Design an enzyme around this catalytic site. Structure first.
Site, PDB file in Angstrom:
ATOM      1  CB  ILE A  68      37.540 -25.489 111.718  1.00 29.18           C
ATOM      2  CG1 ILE A  68      37.035 -24.046 111.887  1.00 29.18           C
ATOM      3  CG2 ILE A  68      37.672 -26.170 113.078  1.00 29.18           C
ATOM      4  CD1 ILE A  68      35.574 -23.933 112.290  1.00 29.18           C
ATOM      5  N   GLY A  69      38.862 -27.604 109.677  1.00 24.83           N
ATOM      6  CA  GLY A  69      39.037 -29.048 109.469  1.00 24.83           C
ATOM      7  C   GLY A  69      38.910 -29.484 108.017  1.00 24.83           C
ATOM      8  CB  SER A  70      40.429 -30.838 105.550  1.00 27.05           C
ATOM      9  OG  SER A  70      41.646 -31.456 105.940  1.00 27.05           O
ATOM     10  CB  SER A  76      33.623 -33.086 104.420  1.00 25.77           C
ATOM     11  OG  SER A  76      34.187 -34.146 105.165  1.00 25.77           O
ATOM     12  N   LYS A  77      35.016 -30.468 104.173  1.00 31.65           N
ATOM     13  CA  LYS A  77      35.807 -29.355 104.743  1.00 31.65           C
ATOM     14  C   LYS A  77      34.951 -28.577 105.750  1.00 31.65           C
ATOM     15  CE  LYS A 103      29.953 -32.517 108.796  1.00 27.80           C
ATOM     16  NZ  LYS A 103      29.845 -34.009 108.665  1.00 27.80           N
ATOM     17  CG  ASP A 145      35.206 -43.590 115.648  1.00 30.92           C
ATOM     18  OD1 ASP A 145      36.045 -44.284 116.255  1.00 30.92           O
ATOM     19  OD2 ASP A 145      35.548 -42.669 114.898  1.00 30.92           O
TER      20      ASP A 145
HETATM   21  C1  LIG Z   1      42.665 -26.037 117.687  1.00 27.20           C
HETATM   22  N1  LIG Z   1      41.282 -25.519 117.491  1.00 27.20           N
HETATM   23  C2  LIG Z   1      40.145 -26.083 117.068  1.00 27.20           C
HETATM   24  C3  LIG Z   1      39.170 -25.087 117.075  1.00 27.20           C
HETATM   25  C4  LIG Z   1      37.826 -25.250 116.710  1.00 27.20           C
HETATM   26  C5  LIG Z   1      37.331 -26.490 116.286  1.00 27.20           C
HETATM   27  C6  LIG Z   1      36.000 -26.650 115.919  1.00 27.20           C
HETATM   28  C7  LIG Z   1      35.113 -25.580 115.975  1.00 27.20           C
HETATM   29  N2  LIG Z   1      33.806 -25.603 115.593  1.00 27.20           N
HETATM   30  C8  LIG Z   1      33.209 -26.578 114.841  1.00 27.20           C
HETATM   31  C9  LIG Z   1      31.871 -26.411 114.459  1.00 27.20           C
HETATM   32  C10 LIG Z   1      31.225 -27.385 113.706  1.00 27.20           C
HETATM   33  C11 LIG Z   1      31.938 -28.513 113.330  1.00 27.20           C
HETATM   34  C12 LIG Z   1      31.356 -29.411 112.613  1.00 27.20           C
HETATM   35  N3  LIG Z   1      30.882 -30.197 111.896  1.00 27.20           N
HETATM   36  C13 LIG Z   1      33.279 -28.647 113.728  1.00 27.20           C
HETATM   37  N4  LIG Z   1      34.012 -29.728 113.372  1.00 27.20           N
HETATM   38  C14 LIG Z   1      35.438 -29.881 113.630  1.00 27.20           C
HETATM   39  C15 LIG Z   1      36.137 -30.237 112.315  1.00 27.20           C
HETATM   40  C16 LIG Z   1      37.548 -30.788 112.493  1.00 27.20           C
HETATM   41  C17 LIG Z   1      37.617 -31.879 113.553  1.00 27.20           C
HETATM   42  C18 LIG Z   1      37.085 -31.375 114.886  1.00 27.20           C
HETATM   43  C19 LIG Z   1      35.636 -30.943 114.715  1.00 27.20           C
HETATM   44  N5  LIG Z   1      33.870 -27.692 114.457  1.00 27.20           N
HETATM   45  C20 LIG Z   1      35.601 -24.368 116.401  1.00 27.20           C
HETATM   46  C21 LIG Z   1      36.932 -24.190 116.768  1.00 27.20           C
HETATM   47  O1  LIG Z   1      37.307 -22.928 117.154  1.00 27.20           O
HETATM   48  C22 LIG Z   1      37.186 -21.874 116.192  1.00 27.20           C
HETATM   49  C23 LIG Z   1      35.984 -21.074 116.485  1.00 27.20           C
HETATM   50  N6  LIG Z   1      35.045 -20.437 116.730  1.00 27.20           N
HETATM   51  C24 LIG Z   1      39.785 -23.912 117.527  1.00 27.20           C
HETATM   52  N7  LIG Z   1      41.087 -24.163 117.787  1.00 27.20           N
END
Ligand SMILES: Cn1cc(-c2ccc(Nc3ccc(C#N)c(NC4CCCCC4)n3)cc2OCC#N)cn1
Length: 258
Positions: A16-18, A22-23, A38, A132
């Protein structure tokens, strides 16, 4: 293609992220249930950098009981080399959901606002000012907004000064009212489709525009005069003149069904 956190085994679907360090993953446990992990790499971070993630985890732990508008941290593992955080997966972050929508439903926006307030209010009650606040810090779960982090950690993308409060900029030569400014711009983004200073691309002019009282934020007339009232009170340059979150919560906009 596999992560073990406190006995349980999780299989990585996608990412989902990086961050640099972290990841974030979408994962499934043994029961085919969806979660978000995470993973943070501690090889190698400064003594100071370490404490940031320790603080973020501690506060995310202590606050589970006080609100359900804080993301849920189910379990976590931490050694000297890594950290794993089993959390709610949710549906999507607020930042992305804002881009993939053209016009925002007023009824949705009011419930999203009410949710953010609750969440930010909570951390305030425990002496935590998010330094932030941005849409990417909020997670939609069943149409319910949840706070993901407290700004103590190091931030993550799937870097803008649009949400930055004037007092932080005037500081160069903390108040809970800073989160009120950042939340203002997020609701401003939900209301007028853009942030108050988005279009000023020159960064030394944008930051100067934020602090400068002579620069006036334009408020177009909407069919919701209260929403307007909130937007103006939140975007007041003087933090003493700016509305508080307990005030924001007694405000007609969030309390009156209309
Ligand atoms: C364009 N896009 C973003 C997402 C998305 C984004 C985040 C999450 N869920 C989580 C759940 C926990 C964390 C934490 N810590 C987290 N962090 C993200 C990481 C990248 C930056 C945005 C926040 N995201 C679930 C998401 O959906 C996938 C599922 N279920 C789906 N599409």
């Amino acid at each position: 293609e596999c992560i073990s956190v406190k006995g349980r085994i999780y299989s990585i679907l996608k990412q989902i992220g990086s961050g640099g360090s972290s990841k974030v993953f979408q994962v499934l446990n043994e029961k085919k249930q969806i979660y978000a992990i995470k993973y943070v790499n501690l090889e190698e971070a400064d003594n100071q950098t370490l404490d940031s993630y320790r603080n973020e985890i501690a506060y995310l732990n202590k606050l589970q009981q006080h609100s359900d508008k804080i993301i849920r941290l189910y379990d976590y593992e931490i050694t000297d080399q890594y950290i794993y955080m089993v959390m709610e997966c949710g549906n999507i972050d607020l930042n992305s959901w804002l881009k993939k929508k053209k016009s925002i439903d007023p009824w949705e926006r009011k419930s999203y606002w009410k949710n953010m307030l609750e969440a930010v209010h909570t951390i305030h009650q425990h002496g935590i000012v998010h330094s932030d606040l941005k849409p990417a810090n909020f997670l939609i779960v069943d149409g319910m907004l949840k706070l993901i982090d407290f700004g103590i950690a190091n931030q993550m993308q799937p870097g803008t000064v649009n949400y930055m409060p004037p007092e932080a900029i005037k500081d160069m030569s903390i108040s809970p009212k800073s989160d009120v400014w950042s939340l203002g711009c997020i609701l401003y983004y939900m209301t007028y489709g853009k942030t108050p200073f988005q279009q000023i691309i020159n960064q030394i002019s944008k930051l100067h525009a934020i602090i400068d009282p002579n620069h006036e934020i334009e408020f177009p007339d909407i069919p919701e005069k209260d929403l307007q009232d909130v937007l103006k009170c939140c975007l007041k340059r003087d933090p003493k003149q700016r509305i508080s979150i307990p005030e924001l919560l007694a405000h007609p906009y969030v309390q009156i069904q209309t």
